[PDB]
Ligand binder design. Structure first.
Ligand SMILES: OC[C@H]1O[C@H](O[C@H]2[C@H](O)[C@@H](O)[C@@H](O)O[C@@H]2CO)[C@H](O)[C@@H](O)[C@@H]1O
Length: 383
């Protein structure tokens, strides 16, 4: 091995290398990490406790690797779906808010961070993809996926395109795949059936086939990723994109007169985005669990704390009732919640990591022509 060898060092160098008396926080690079750092500076100014916010690449993969050895950040930020796996591996602490604090957040946000009956993270905000469109190029967005080919033909004649979004992450293609019947794991009798995966059915096939056909007919490019799509939309080159609340800040900066709205239907069915709750978990190896709790409950999850993050990159519909009442006025938030209602909240089971990896490969291989749609989804279904 070169993992059982550090089983020997971790005791000799006993025990744990997370620095006591400060907080290290990891959050994804597309989120308001500068705004979160402002909340951390307020904490430091009040309490003397230094807070360092980091946004490493692939943190959702690095965290279980480093936390398994007792290293990593004190606090990890990510959508709730990854947290059941972390908790199953013993990497997350059970969190302990009194009832007065729990009443400050929406009951459904607490449910996303409950694993085997216990709370394993603090919920921050509800994320759902919406259709984002350029009102100057497209005063009225398409109601259906099916009319997008004809729209692209029209826009292509003008050196524009209809739609670009990140084809590299299955998160972004899922709303179309799920629209006519795709699902991850079938939930029944109080639990997810890990042997009942729904990525190989007729509905999932129809959705992915529609996407592949878009690419075959030159209405999309298989290599489009997050940065390519964001640049194209914000430069005014494409009429539509698909993204979450965090993206609105850069569009504000851009020249673009944009709207946020319901995703198009497919075969008459609503697109069904998987809904994420951005959540903050506490590293089980952290010597700073009480510090982490004080920071999360009394500094971040306040009107002032969430505002600071939100002003950097919008959080979506926040879990904190008092602040959401102010944000609910925003039509972009209304659209987010409309898409969220039509979708469904992600599972947090340990199998989600394998699921996302399977679907990622399936979409990329089908989109690039390395596999047929049937072949790709059959593979993703198995196991
Ligand atoms: O694409 C698979 C990916 O989907 C979700 O990741 C989202 C995340 O929830 C959003 O907050 C935002 O950062 O975009 C990500 C997609 O690039 C799942 O949460 C994640 O576990 C999964 O791998």
């Amino acid at each position: 091995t070169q993992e059982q060898l550090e089983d020997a060092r971790r005791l000799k160098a006993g025990s744990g290398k997370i620095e006591e008396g400060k907080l290290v926080i990891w959050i994804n690079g597309d989120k308001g990490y500068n705004g979160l750092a402002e909340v951390g500076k307020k904490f430091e100014k009040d309490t003397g406790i230094k807070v360092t916010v980091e946004h490493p690449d692939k943190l959702e993969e690095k965290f279980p690797q480093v936390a398994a050895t007792g290293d990593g950040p004190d606090i990890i930020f990510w959508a709730h779906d990854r947290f059941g796996g972390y908790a199953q591996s013993g990497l997350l602490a059970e969190i302990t808010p009194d009832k007065a604090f729990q009443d400050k957040l929406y009951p459904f946000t607490w449910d996303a961070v409950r694993y085997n009956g216990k709370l394993i993270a603090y919920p921050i905000a509800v994320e759902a993809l919406s259709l984002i469109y350029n009102k100057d190029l497209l005063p009225n967005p398409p109601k259906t996926w099916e009319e997008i080919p004809a729209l692209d033909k029209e826009l292509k004649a003008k050196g524009k395109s209809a739609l670009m979004f990140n084809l590299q992450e299955p998160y972004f293609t899922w709303p179309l795949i799920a629209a006519d019947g795709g699902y991850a794991f079938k939930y029944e009798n109080g639990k997810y059936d890990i042997k009942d995966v729904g990525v190989d059915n007729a509905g999932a096939k129809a959705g992915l086939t529609f996407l592949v056909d878009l690419i075959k007919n030159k209405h999309m490019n298989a290599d489009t990723d997050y940065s390519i799509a964001e640049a194209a939309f914000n430069k005014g080159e494409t009429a539509m994109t698909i993204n979450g609340p965090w993206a609105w800040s850069n569009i504000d900066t851009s020249k673009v007169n944009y709207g946020v709205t319901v995703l198009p239907t497919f075969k008459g069915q609503p697109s069904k985005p998987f809904v994420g709750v951005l959540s903050a978990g506490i590293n089980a190896a952290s010597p700073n669990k009480e510090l982490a709790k004080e920071f999360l409950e009394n500094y971040l999850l306040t009107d002032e704390g969430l505002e600071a993050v939100n002003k950097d990159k919008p959080l979506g519909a926040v879990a904190l009732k008092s602040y959401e009442e102010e944000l609910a006025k925003d039509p972009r938030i209304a659209a987010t919640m409309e898409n969220a209602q039509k979708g469904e909240i992600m599972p947090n089971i340990p199998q989600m990591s394998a699921f996302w990896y399977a679907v990622r490969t399936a979409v990329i291989n089908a989109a690039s022509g390395r596999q047929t749609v049937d072949e790709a989804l059959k593979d993703a279904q198995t196991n």
